[PDB]
A paper describes a structure:
Hemorrhagic toxin (TcsH) is a major virulence factor produced by Paeniclostridium sordellii, which is a non-negligible threat to women undergoing childbirth or abortions. Similar to other LCTs, TcsH comprises four structural domains: an N-terminal glucosyltransferase domain (GTD), a cysteine protease domain (CPD), a combined transmembrane delivery and receptor-binding domain (DRBD), and a C-terminal combined repetitive oligopeptides (CROPs) domain. Here, we show the cryo-EM structures of the TcsH-TMPRSS2 complex and uncover that TcsH binds to the serine protease domain (SPD) of TMPRSS2 through the CROP unit-VI.
To understand how TcsH recognizes TMPRSS2, we set out to determine the structure of full-length TcsH in complex with the ectodomain of TMPRSS2. Because TMPRSS2 simultaneously undergoes autoproteolysis, we introduced an R255Q mutation that prevents the self-cleavage and generated an extracellular domain fragment of TMPRSS2 namely TMPRSS2106-492/R255Q or TMPRSS2ECD. TMPRSS2ECD was used for forming the complex with TcsH at neutral pH. The cryo-EM analysis reconstituted a complex map: 3.2 Å for residues 1-2387 including the “core” domains (GTD, CPD, and DRBD) and 6.0 Å for the rest part. Notably, an extra lobe of EM density was observed at the C-terminal tip of the CROPs domain and inferred as the bound TMPRSS2ECD. The structure of the TcsH part presents a TcdA-like “closed” conformation, of which the CROPs domain curves downward alongside the DRBD domain. The CROPs domain is bridged to the DRBD domain through the CROP unit-IV, which likely forms a relatively stable configuration of the “core” domains and the CROP unit-I to IV. However, the CROP unit-V and VI along with the presumable TMPRSS2ECD were in low resolution, possibly due to the flexibility of these regions in the full-length toxin. Since the TMPRSS2 binding site in TcsH is far away from the core domains and would unlikely cause conformational change to the toxin, we believe that it could represent the structure of native TcsH at neutral pH.
Residue numbers in the entry:
A (entry chain A): 2399 to 2616
B (entry chain B): 142 to 249, 260 to 492
Write the structure that this text describes.
C-alpha cells in the first residue's frame, strides 16, 4: 500500500509516485496487470519485466500481445491497450470496451453475429441465443466478413468431417430429422450428425453410414 | 518413358534400391559394383527427396531373387537409368541399400519431450483442429477432411512442432503453410483416400525434439495384430476437448476382415483404410487426434502406418478408430514431392 506522505491517505486508482505510475484498487492494494489510465489502459508489470522496472510500475509495452491470467490484450504504438476492432497481422480481433480483454463466446455486433474465442472469430457451428449457426469464412456468402454468421438454409454443411444440416431459418437442426427420404440424427450438444458405426441414442442402438444416413437394420 | 522406364523404388525394411525393368515388367535390385555416392544421390533426387541423402552401402542379398540391373561406366554422361542393364549375377555378391533421409529414431499418460518429434499441431484461427506427421523438412501428412472445401486456403493454417503444451502454442509462432494438396480421388462422403499434403513455407529444422518419421517401404509384412502407438492432443475423457497435454496410447492393429464385420463396421472400410483399436477399450484416439500419426516399430525403425480418419465412440471400443493407409498413397506422395521440385 502507498500512503500520501502529506495526507497519509491510501492511494486509489491511477497514481503517479516519483514520476512512476502505479494503480491501486478500491481497497488501496497495488495491482498487477492492465488498468485504465488517463491516456488509456496501461500495463503495470512485475518487477524487472522491462528496464529493471519496479513491481507495479507501468512499463513501455506496445505493438505486441499480452497474456495475463488467461486474459489476452494488445498494445499499439502508444503503449495503450486497444479496444474494438483492430487489424493485427491481417486478422481482426475484438476486445471488450469495458475491460479490454479478448472477446469470448457468442457476441452480436451491429447486426453481424460472431463466436469469439480469445478475441478471434471462429469458423464452424457454435450455439448462440437462438441456437447453432454456420459461422463461415470471409466472402462465403454476400460479402460477409471473416467469421460472420451467414444465411444457410435447406442444405447440408460439411466441416472437418462434421456434417451439419440447416433448416429454412438458417439454424442447424438437432435430434431426429428426415431429409430427402433419409433419416438423420444430430447430437443436441453439438449438432454434429452421428456417422460411421453403432451409436447409443436414447438407450438404443442405431447404425449410420459415414455420410450420416441411418441404416435401418430392422 | 518417365512413368515406367525411369521409376526407382526403395524396398523392404532394409532400404534395398530397385529399378523397374520394362523389358521383363519387374522390379530389380542393383549390383553394388561400380556404384558410389553420386548415383545414390541421383536415385534419391529422382525419388522426390531433392537434396536429402543419408547413407548408401552394400548389404548381402536376402530377397533371394537372381537378377540385377547392372550399371555402366563407358556409356557417357547419359541418364543414370539409361545405363542400368540386366545381368545374371555380379561378382560383388552385394546389392545396394540406399537411405535418402535419416528418420525413425526417437528419444528413449503424457508423452515426454522428444518422444514423438514428428508430431505437429495445425492451428486454424488459433485453435487446435488437426494434427500431422513430418516426413521431410518441408512436408507434413494429414487428412483430406481437415482441409476440405471451406477451409482450403493455405493461409488459414499454421503448424507447431516440438511443443508439448497447447497453452505454449502461441499466436505468430507456428509455421505458415504455403500450399494445400488433397488427393484428387478424395470423396467427401465416404472420405475414401483421406490424405492431404501440406507444404510448409520454410523448412523444418531437425533436432532431438523434431525429426521425420519414415514412410512404409514396399514389402513390410505387417503381422495380423501389431503393437502400434497413437499420439495427439485430444481428451481421454469423453465429452471433452483438446487436451492441455500431448498423450500417447498403445494400440493394436485389427484385421480388415474383422473390422468390416457386422458388429463392427459392415463393409464401411475400403482398401485404403486401417483399423487400430485396443482390447478392453480404455485407450483409442479422440477429437483433435484426427489427422494424427499412427506409427509402429519394426526392425528398429519407427514407421508411419496411417493417419486418423474417423470413429464411433473413441475409447468406447467395439467401435474402434480408422486411419488411412499411408503405404497405398506413398507413390502419390512421391509424385507430389517430385513435381514440386
Amino acid at each position: 500500500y502507498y500512503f500520501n506522505p502529506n495526507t497519509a491517505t491510501t492511494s486509489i486508482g491511477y497514481t503517479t509516485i516519483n514520476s512512476k505510475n502505479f494503480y491501486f484498487n478500491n481497497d488501496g492494494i497495488m495491482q498487477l496487470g492492465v488498468f485504465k489510465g488517463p491516456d488509456g489502459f496501461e500495463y503495470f508489470a512485475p518487477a524487472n519485466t522491462h528496464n529493471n522496472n519496479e513491481e507495479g510500475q507501468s512499463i513501455t509495452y506496445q505493438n505486441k500481445f499480452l497474456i495475463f491470467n488467461e486474459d489476452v490484450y494488445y498494445f499499439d504504438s502508444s503503449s495503450k491497450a486497444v479496444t474494438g476492432w483492430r487489424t493485427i497481422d491481417d486478422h481482426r480481433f475484438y476486445f471488450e470496451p469495458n475491460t479490454g480483454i479478448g472477446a469470448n463466446g457468442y457476441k452480436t455486433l451491429d447486426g453481424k453475429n460472431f463466436y469469439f474465442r480469445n478475441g478471434l472469430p471462429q469458423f464452424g457451428v457454435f450455439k448462440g441465443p437462438d441456437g447453432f449457426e454456420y459461422f463461415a469464412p470471409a466472402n462465403t456468402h454476400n460479402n460477409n466478413e471473416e467469421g460472420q454468421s451467414i444465411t444457410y438454409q435447406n442444405k447440408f454443411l460439411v466441416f472437418l468431417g462434421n456434417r451439419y444440416y440447416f433448416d429454412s431459418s438458417s439454424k442447424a437442426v438437432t435430434g431426429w430429422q428426415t431429409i430427402n427420404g433419409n433419416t438423420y440424427y444430430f447430437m443436441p450438444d453439438t449438432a454434429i450428425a452421428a456417422a460411421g458405426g453403432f451409436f447409443t441414442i436414447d438407450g438404443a442402438i442405431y447404425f449410420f453410414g459415414i455420410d450420416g444416413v441411418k441404416q435401418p437394420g430392422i | 518413358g518417365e512413368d515406367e522406364n525411369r521409376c526407382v523404388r526403395l524396398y523392404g525394411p532394409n532400404f534395398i534400391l530397385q529399378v523397374y525393368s520394362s523389358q521383363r515388367k519387374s522390379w530389380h535390385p542393383v549390383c553394388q559394383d561400380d556404384w558410389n555416392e553420386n548415383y545414390g544421390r541421383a536415385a534419391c533426387r529422382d525419388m522426390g527427396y531433392k537434396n536429402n541423402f543419408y547413407s548408401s552401402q552394400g548389404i548381402v542379398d536376402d530377397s533371394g531373387s537372381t537378377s540385377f540391373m547392372k550399371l555402366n561406366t563407358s556409356a557417357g554422361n547419359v541418364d543414370i537409368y539409361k545405363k542400368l542393364y540386366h545381368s545374371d549375377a555380379c561378382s560383388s555378391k552385394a546389392v545396394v541399400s540406399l537411405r535418402c533421409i535419416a528418420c525413425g529414431v526417437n528419444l528413449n499418460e503424457s508423452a515426454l519431450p522428444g518422444a514423438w518429434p514428428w508430431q505437429v499441431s495445425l492451428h486454424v484461427q488459433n485453435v487446435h483442429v488437426c494434427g500431422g506427421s513430418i516426413i521431410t523438412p518441408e512436408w507434413i501428412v494429414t487428412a483430406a477432411h481437415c482441409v476440405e472445401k471451406p477451409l482450403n486456403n493455405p493461409w488459414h493454417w499454421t503448424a507447431f512442432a516440438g511443443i508439448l503444451r497447447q497453452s505454449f502454442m502461441f499466436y505468430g509462432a507456428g509455421y505458415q503453410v504455403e500450399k494445400v494438396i488433397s488427393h484428387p480421388n478424395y470423396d467427401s462422403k465416404t472420405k475414401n483416400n483421406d490424405i492431404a499434403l501440406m507444404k510448409l513455407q520454410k523448412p523444418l529444422t531437425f533436432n532431438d525434439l523434431v525429426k521425420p518419421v519414415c514412410l512404409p517401404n514396399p514389402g513390410m509384412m505387417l503381422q495380423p495384430e501389431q503393437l502400434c502407438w497413437i499420439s495427439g492432443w485430444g481428451a481421454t475423457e469423453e465429452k471433452g476437448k483438446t487436451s492441455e497435454v500431448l498423450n500417447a496410447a498403445k494400440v493394436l492393429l485389427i484385421e480388415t476382415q474383422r473390422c468390416n464385420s457386422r458388429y463392427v463396421y459392415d463393409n464401411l472400410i475400403t482398401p485404403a483404410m486401417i483399423c487400430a483399436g485396443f482390447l478392453q477399450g480404455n485407450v483409442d484416439s479422440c477429437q483433435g487426434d484426427s489427422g494424427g500419426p499412427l506409427v509402429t516399430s519394426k526392425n528398429n525403425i519407427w514407421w508411419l502406418i496411417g493417419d486418423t480418419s474417423w470413429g464411433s465412440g473413441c475409447a468406447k471400443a467395439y467401435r474402434p478408430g480408422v486411419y488411412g493407409n499411408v503405404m497405398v498413397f506413398t507413390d502419390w506422395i512421391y509424385r507430389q514431392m517430385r513435381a514440386d521440385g
